[PDB]
């Protein structure tokens, strides 16, 4: 009786498990056991796990469009769960075990999911009684609180159905199966990944980069090598994990490299199997990049540029070598099927080489909108200023860029105060608003201070540890320091 996506309909299940039919006994996952032994899970075994979890989820009587919060690390079980949800047209919302309780309750209060699922050994408690709770693992899917009874109204799952919603106020980027599959078919055309690659992925599951990596590995028929935080956060463990698993590609925000470059460059140079690196989210400092390139001469390095609302836009391979005089890396050219307009403040195309305009993107991987926020959606997904009468829309990105002499793009900052911390969007005004509401604080300023830059709060007023907790806002948005000051200097 549960609706299931048909094989011809754009859907993460069919797209990411195609290799289960065409190459069943190739690896989909490489993990290392408690004894430092490397294990592989095939496409065949992963599909089997997805189908078992789907049979169990379908018993809960959820309707297509019903939301499922998945709290987990990037694990085979977690990816089976999100693909099981995909098959049944249950949009999933990824959250990490390390997500603050305050932040998880804000997502539950905003999304109103029918179900929260965590791993057998997850420690999340006190999920409100209006949300179903289940645990998944070796034992299958076990219900604690079944979701409330309902009538199923949706007969058939379609490509425009929501695959996932990525989350001061939690902003839900609503992404269709059609959009996500379109992004991957564009990338597949570039031959950037082969089924022979083993892609090390570093971002926790709640970040859009984790979903990108998952879909990139599985949709290509490649092996995903999730790097747990217990390896990632310790350069010598990180590097031994990449060696043991035989990672051929390593994906992560530039920050993942900074501790390794500073403290274990010799061991880094030993990663003879790494054939490529991909970074996105923020600028990679050029000295650090030149250092990395010098240590791993046999690695292609790709600069990916994109926002959550299209997932991706453009890339370049970094020039080999990086010229000494080079002031700024190119973000290269849009993927095939994507198109960028650079518009001035009047919506007019910027035609002159080297003059910045606001990126307006035409993409087959566009988000459907912001969860329950049609006003935010109308501000960002706008009438095509070059074709307003067709009804067609573009992503107004807030990013500035200019073109070079070959038409390649160059990121030129933003139209607003937005900064990146480890590739995470941050509106300093938001951290400021929050500290201004801490009892004692009359004025506040948050800025990136320069190793990687740190978020510093300067406040006019006091327990800096207590003001920290009151912030602890998402994780990456919590000041590395809160310094009381007599006046904010202009």
């Amino acid at each position: 009786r549960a609706a299931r996506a048909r094989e011809s309909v754009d859907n993460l299940y069919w797209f990411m498990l195609a290799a289960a039919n065409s190459a069943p006994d190739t690896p989909a996952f490489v993990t290392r056991d408690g004894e430092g032994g490397v294990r592989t899970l095939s496409y065949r075994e992963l599909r089997t796990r997805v189908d078992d979890f789907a049979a169990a989820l379908a018993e809960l009587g959820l309707d297509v469009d019903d939301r499922v919060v998945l709290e987990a690390n990037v694990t085979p079980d977690a990816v089976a769960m999100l693909l099981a949800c995909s098959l049944l047209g249950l949009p999933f919302i990824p959250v990490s075990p390390e997500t603050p309780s305050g932040r998880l309750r804000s997502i539950l209060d905003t999304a109103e999911p029918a179900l929260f699922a965590q791993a057998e050994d997850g420690g999340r408690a006190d999920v409100p009684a209006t949300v179903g709770t289940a645990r998944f693992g070796a034992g299958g899917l076990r219900v604690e609180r079944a979701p409330r009874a309902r009538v199923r109204h949706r007969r058939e799952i379609v490509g425009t159905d929501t695959a996932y919603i990525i989350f001061g106020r939690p902003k839900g980027v609503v992404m269709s199966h059609r959009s996500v599959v379109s992004l991957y078919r564009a990338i597949l055309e570039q031959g950037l990944i082969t089924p022979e690659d083993r892609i090390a992925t570093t971002s926790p599951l709640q970040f859009c980069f984790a979903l990108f990596d998952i879909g990139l590995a599985l949709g290509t028929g490649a092996a995903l090598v999730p790097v747990p935080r217990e390896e990632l956060n310790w350069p010598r463990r990180f590097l031994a994990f990449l060696g043991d698993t035989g990672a051929t590609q390593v994906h992560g925000v530039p920050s993942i490299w900074r501790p390794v470059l500073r403290h274990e460059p010799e061991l880094l140079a030993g990663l003879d199997r790494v054939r490529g690196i991909l970074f996105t989210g923020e600028d990679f400092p050029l000295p650090e990049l030149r250092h990395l390139q010098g240590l791993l001469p046999h690695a292609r390095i790709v600069n990916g540029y994109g926002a959550t609302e299209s997932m991706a836009c453009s890339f370049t391979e970094v020039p080999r070598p990086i010229p000494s005089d080079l002031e700024r890396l190119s973000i290269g050219f849009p993927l095939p099927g994507f198109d960028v307009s650079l518009l001035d403040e009047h919506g007019r195309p910027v035609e002159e080489i080297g003059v910045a305009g606001q990126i307006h993107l035409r993409a087959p991987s566009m988000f459907s909108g912001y969860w329950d926020d049609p006003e935010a959606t109308a501000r960002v997904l706008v009438s095509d200023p070059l074709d307003p009468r067709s009804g067609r829309t573009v992503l107004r990105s807030g990013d500035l860029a200019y073109r070079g002499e070959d038409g390649e793009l160059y990121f030129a900052g933003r139209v607003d105060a937005q900064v990146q911390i480890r590739g995470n969007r941050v509106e300093p005004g938001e951290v400021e608003r929050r500290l201004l509401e801490f009892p004692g604080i009359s004025a506040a300023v948050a800025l990136l201070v320069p190793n990687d830059p740190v978020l510093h709060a300067f406040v006019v007023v006091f327990d800096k540890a207590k003001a920290r907790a009151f912030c602890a806002l998402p994780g990456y948005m919590i000041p590395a320091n809160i310094v009381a000051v007599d006046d904010i200097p202009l």
Partner: protein, 78 residues
Amino acid sequence: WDDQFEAIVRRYVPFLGPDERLGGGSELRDLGLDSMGTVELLAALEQAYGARFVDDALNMENFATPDALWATLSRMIT
């Protein structure tokens, strides 16, 4: 723990007041020790002591508190 250790740890916990005792059981994450910070603290300790943390000693439990980290350092020297 010796005066060198307190001074190094204090460097990586900006929410600890100059005037405030470094409590042996203080959750260093709650005093501002983050992912990058933790690796900088490791490197500072290895550098100042000539100590080597074996792979098994590089974990969040050993770096959670000054008392846990002092014992781990002490075990590495031994």
